Amino acid sequence: PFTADKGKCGLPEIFDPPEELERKVWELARLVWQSSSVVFHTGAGISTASGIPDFRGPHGVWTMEERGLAPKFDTTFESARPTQTHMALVQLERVGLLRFLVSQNVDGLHVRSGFPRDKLAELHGNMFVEECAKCKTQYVRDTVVGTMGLKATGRLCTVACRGELRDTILDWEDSLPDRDLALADEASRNADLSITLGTSLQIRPSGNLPLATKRRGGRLVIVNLQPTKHDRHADLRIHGYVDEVMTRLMKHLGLEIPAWDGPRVLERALPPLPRPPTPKLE
Ligand SMILES: Nc1ncnc2c1ncn2[C@@H]1O[C@H](COP(=O)(O)OP(=O)(O)OC[C@H]2O[C@H](O)[C@H](O)[C@@H]2O)[C@@H](O)[C@H]1O
Ligand SMILES: Cn1cnc(C[C@H](N)C(=O)O)c1
Numbered sequence: 275p276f277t278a279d280k281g282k283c284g285l286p287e288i289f290d291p292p293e294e295l296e297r298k299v300w301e302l303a304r305l306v307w308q309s310s311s312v313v314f315h316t317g318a319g320i321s322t323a324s325g326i327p328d329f330r331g332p333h334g335v336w337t338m339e340e341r342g343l344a345p346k347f348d349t350t351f352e353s354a355r356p357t358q359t360h361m362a363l364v365q366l367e368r369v370g371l372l373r374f375l376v377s378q379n380v381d382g383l384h385v386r387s388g389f390p391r392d393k394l395a396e397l398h399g400n401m402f403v404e405e406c407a408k409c410k411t412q413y414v415r416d417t418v419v420g421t422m423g424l425k426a427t428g429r430l431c432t433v434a435c436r437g438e439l440r441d442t443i444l445d446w447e448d449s450l451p452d453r454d455l456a457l458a459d460e461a462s463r464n465a466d467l468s469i470t471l472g473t474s475l476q477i478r479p480s481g482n483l484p485l486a487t488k489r490r491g492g493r494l495v496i497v498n499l500q501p502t503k504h505d506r507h508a509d510l511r512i513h514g515y516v517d518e519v520m521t522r523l524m525k526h527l528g529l530e531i532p533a534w535d536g537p538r539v540l541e542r543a544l545p546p547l548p549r550p551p552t553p554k555l556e
C-alpha cells in the first residue's frame with residue numbers, strides 16, 4: 275500500500291509536430307484498414323479530457339502525491355461524460371473495426387458510453403459495478419459503489435440469493451478477474467493489430483497484453499503523450515492528444531463519432547453496422 279511501487283511518474287510529454295502527426299494517423303488508418311482483428315487497450319489518458327486525472331502524467335494522482343500535491347478532478351465520476359475517444363471506440367465496435375476493448379480504467383465511462391460489455395475487459399474493475407460473492411451476478415449502478423478493494427458495499431443480491439454485494443476495485447495485491455484477463459489475453463494473442471491509447475503500460479499483466487499481439491507477426495501502435503514501458507516494441511508511436519488522434523482517424527475511416535444519449539448499459543454487441551468500402555492501399 276504505502277510501499278506499493280507506483281512506477282515511473284511525471285516523465286516529460288512528447289508532442290509530434292503537425293506534419294509527422296498527420297502522417298502517423300494516416301499510417302494508423304492504413305493499419306486499421308489492413309487488419310482483420312483490431313484490439314484496443316485503454317488507460318487513464320483517455321479520460322483526462324473529461325476532467326479525470328491520470329496516475330503518472332504531469333498532474334497524475336501518483337505524480338502529484340510524489341510532489342506532496344493533490345490530484346485535481348474537474349468532474350465527479352457521476353457527471354463525467356465519455357470523451358470523443360470513448361465515443362469513437364463505440365462506433366468502431368459498431369461498424370465491426372474493433373474486435374475487443376481491454377481497459378485498466380475503473381472510471382465506468384466505457385460501460386456508460388454504451389460500449390457492449392461482452393467486448394469489454396475491465397481488468398482493474400469498475401467503480402459503478404458491484405458483484406455478488408455468492409452468485410457472481412454484477413450490478414451496474416448509476417452512482418459509484420462506495421467501497422474499493424473488493425469490500426462489502428452494504429447491499430444484498432436481489433436475483434430470483436441475498437448474497438453480499440462487493441465492489442470490483444482491485445487493491446495492489448489483488449490478481450485480475452480471471453474471466454476478463456482470459457478474454458483480454460485471447461483477444462490480444464489473436465489480434466493482428468493492438469492499438470494502445472493513454473496507458474503508460476507499466477502494470478503487469480495489463481500493460482503486457484498488447485505485446486502478445488506482436489507474436490505471430492501482429493502490429494502494435496502506441497498512442498501516448500509520455501513514453502511507455504514497451505515503446506521499443508511499437509511499429510508506430512503517436513505522441514499527441516488521444517482525441518486529436520481518434521477524430522483524425524475517424525475522418526480518414528469515413529466514420530462519424532456518435533452522440534452520447536447519457537449513461538446507458540449494453541450487455542451484448544450487435545452484428546456490425548454498414549461501414550465505408552476500404553481504400554486501395556499498396
Ligand atoms: N489526452 C491524452 N492524450 C494522450 N495521452 C494522454 C492523455 N492524457 C494522458 N495521457 C497519457 O496517458 C498515460 C496514462 O498512464 P497512467 O497514468 O500510468 O495510467 P494507466 O491507465 O496506464 O495506469 C494503469 C494502472 O495504474 C494505476 O495504479 C491504476 O491501477 C491504473 O489502472 C500517461 O502516460 C499520459 O502521458
Ligand atoms: C492496478 N492493479 C491491481 N492489481 C493488478 C494486477 C497485479 N499486477 C497482479 O496480478 O497481482 C493491477
Ligand SMILES: [Zn+2]
Binds near residue numbers: 406407409411435
Ligand atoms: Zn447473488
